[PDB]
Amino acid sequence: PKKVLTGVVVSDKMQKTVTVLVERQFPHPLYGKVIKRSKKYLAHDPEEKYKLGDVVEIIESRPISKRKRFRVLRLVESGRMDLVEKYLIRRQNYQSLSKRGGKA
């Protein structure tokens, strides 16, 4: 079965491509506590049909480009930057904890 995944479009800054942030939980192999963990897939969007904030499903596909191996299957729930927001802030903290520092 071609793998199907669900994540949030955290980037529509490309031509016919969207970055989908897929999240997944699971027990820690030794400590058992359930831990969240995520990943970004560059899904193909031929019709630039998906916008920043959409919760789409990604489908395993025949390679489209290096890095692109998934296609946007269908939209699950439109708009919701509450999720995108998280992502961006996590990003913002980066440029900080290097040579000088971040925020609070």
Which residues of the shown chain bind RNA in the complex (CB under 7 A)? 1-3, 11, 13-17, 19, 24-27, 29-34, 36-42, 44, 46, 60-69, 71, 86, 89-91, 93-95, 97-99, 102-104
Q: For the chain, what's the residue count?
A: 104
The percent of the chain in helix, strand and coil, each rounded to the nearest 5, is: 15, 50, 40
The two tokens of residue 87 are 């992502």
Tokens of 41: 């897939």
Closest CA to 14 of 61, 53, 40, 51: 51
